[PDB]
């Protein structure tokens, strides 16, 4: 997280760390949605340009973490992937359209004070919350500068930008399945996700029922916290039908 802040313990109990078995390293962020499902970006598992194409047995999921590198005994829990599911219509070739994937843990993880799932939104939630100006929150253990690594989980609250501004910030064809967030150059404040953060959650707390809902997944960005650039996120709700069908098809 560029221009973020140190997370408080249990502030983001649904935060997941995609961890490479060998070499042991951070791959991306991810989120706990149920006791057997972790949500992340499809590009964390498959992105041919960067030569990325992981299989279940290549990854470990580390849940309950706060510290970046330290194995937090008695606090975190590490799970193995049973099956990975990537959106059948995810466009890695062109613009990372439908950048989302699900990972089914080999066995359910026990919730605790540091491990707890995030709610996925429904039509009405997305409707009332996903509006330009509204601040969501992004968290991660990735780069603190576009071009070090943090010691602890970082957090930054970023406002949702208008579709027009997003489109007018890049040459990439933006789709309805995406939204961008971040502060404008004149807005004073700044902040953004960065390498190591992708696949992670963009959550908002509903002022109606006080729950945290994941509206977005850190998808892509040009650099990290640049003037005039924005972070792009997978529109979680627009693809919930794919999430529902997958979970109530092979899920538990």
């Amino acid at each position: 997280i560029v221009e973020g802040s140190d997370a408080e313990i249990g502030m983001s109990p649904w935060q997941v760390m995609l961890f490479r078995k060998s070499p042991q390293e951070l791959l991306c962020g991810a989120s706990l949605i149920s006791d057997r499902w972790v949500l992340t970006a499809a590009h964390c598992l498959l992105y041919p340009p960067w030569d990325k194409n992981f299989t279940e047995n290549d990854l470990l999921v580390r849940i309950g973490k706060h510290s970046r590198t330290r194995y937090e005994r008695n606090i975190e829990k590490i799970s193995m992937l049973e099956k990975i599911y990537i959106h059948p219509r995810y466009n890695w070739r062109e613009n990372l359209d439908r950048d989302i994937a699900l990972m089914k843990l080999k066995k359910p993880v026990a919730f605790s004070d540091y491990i707890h799932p995030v709610c996925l939104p429904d039509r009405e939630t997305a409707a009332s919350l996903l509006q330009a100006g509204y601040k969501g929150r992004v968290t991660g253990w990735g780069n603190l500068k576009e071009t070090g690594q943090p010691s602890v989980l970082q957090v930054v609250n970023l406002p949702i930008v208008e579709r027009p501004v997003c489109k007018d910030s890049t040459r990439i064809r933006i789709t309805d399945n995406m939204f961008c967030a971040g502060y404008k150059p004149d807005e004073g404040k700044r902040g953004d996700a960065c390498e190591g953060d992708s696949g992670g959650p963009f959550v908002m707390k509903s002022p109606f029922n006080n729950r945290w809902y994941q509206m977005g997944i850190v998808s892509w960005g040009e650099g990290c916290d640049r003037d005039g650039k924005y972070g792009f996120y997978t529109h979680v709700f627009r693809l919930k039908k794919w999430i529902q069908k997958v979970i109530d098809q092979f899920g538990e």
Binding site: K21, Q24, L26, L60, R62, T69, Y71, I78
Partner: peptide, 10 residues
């Protein structure tokens, strides 16, 4: 610079 995790997870 990651800390070794329990071999049990491999």
């Amino acid at each position: 610079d990651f800390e070794e995790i329990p071999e049990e997870y491999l």
